[PDB]
Amino acid sequence: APRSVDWREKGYVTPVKNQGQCGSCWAFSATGALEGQMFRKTGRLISLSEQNLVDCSGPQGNEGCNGGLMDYAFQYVQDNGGLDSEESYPYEATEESCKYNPKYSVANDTGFVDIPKQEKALMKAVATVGPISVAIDAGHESFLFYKEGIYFEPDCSSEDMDHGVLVVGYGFESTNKYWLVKNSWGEEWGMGGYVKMAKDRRNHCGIASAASYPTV
Numbered sequence: 001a002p003r004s005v006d007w008r009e010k011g012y013v014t015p016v017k018n019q020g021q022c023g024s025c026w027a028f029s030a031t032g033a034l035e036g037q038m039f040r041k042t043g044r045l046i047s048l049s050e051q052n053l054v055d056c057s058g059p060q061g062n063e064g065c066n067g068g069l070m071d072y073a074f075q076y077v078q079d080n081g082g083l084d085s086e087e088s089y090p091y092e093a094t095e096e097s098c099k100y101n102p103k104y105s106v107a108n109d110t111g112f113v114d115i116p117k118q119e120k121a122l123m124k125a126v127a128t129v130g131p132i133s134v135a136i137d138a139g140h141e142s143f144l145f146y147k148e149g150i151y152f153e154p155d156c157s158s159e160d161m162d163h164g165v166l167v168v169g170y171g172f173e174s175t176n177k178y179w180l181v182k183n184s185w186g187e188e189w190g191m192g193g194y195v196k197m198a199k200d201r202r203n204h205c206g207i208a209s210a211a212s213y214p215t216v
């Protein structure tokens with residue numbers, strides 16, 4: 001693979017969003033992966049509606065602001081035949097009745113791929129596909145209060161992840177490998193909304209344990 005990758009530089013990544021006090025990280029991880037895949041397919045980068053996922057993907061297993069899985073979101077978009085734009089269906093940070101309107105659908109998917117559970121497979125996916133949805137163990141104050149540099153937490157689990165985020169690239173410090181992760185905690189958290197998660201450190205915080213992307 002290339003020694004570093006940053007899909008932001010190629011136009012695949014919308015600005016950092018803020019999930020607020022709703023357990024909708026999964027929805028933001030899923031929209032970020034589908035935003036990348038639709039951009040690779042069409043050349044247009046269009047922010048997608050997490051609210052549509054929060055309100056409408058119960059049949060596929062999601063639980064609104066109580067949590068959900070990116071793969072259940074990709075399954076909803078396939079079963080539904082579409083997903084509305086953020087502009088048509090803006091975020092409210094509370095689960096509400098489903099308001100999906102196919103007129104304003106700007107994305108679709110035909111399933112999803114679960115990446116083998118190892119960092120070399122993750123690297124190959126990020127280099128060949130685009131941004132990849134992943135889950136991490138974010139359940140340490142060291143994560144909550146992360147500001148900059150490479151995130152390493154000696155108590156991180158590779159098995160017990162609790163937060164969905166988006167890997168948009170990977171690289172190494174010029175001073176030590178990292179994954180470049182877009183969070184959904186707004187731009188004031190971490191490095192403009194991003195975190196450098198340790199890479200090639202025994203699948204630190206389980207970043208390669210639940211990685212996937214949608215097919216389009």
Ligand SMILES: *C(=N)c1ncc(F)c(N(CCOc2ccccc2)Cc2ccc3c(c2)OCO3)n1
Nearest residue numbers: 023024025066067068069135161162163164210
């Ligand atoms: C995100 N803000 C958030 N908040 C609460 C919460 F319970 C979760 N879950 C998803 C993030 O963690 C993972 C995603 C992918 C893989 C492994 C972990 C956990 C969760 C809660 C509720 C349901 C889930 C998952 O699926 C069935 O319903 N995220």
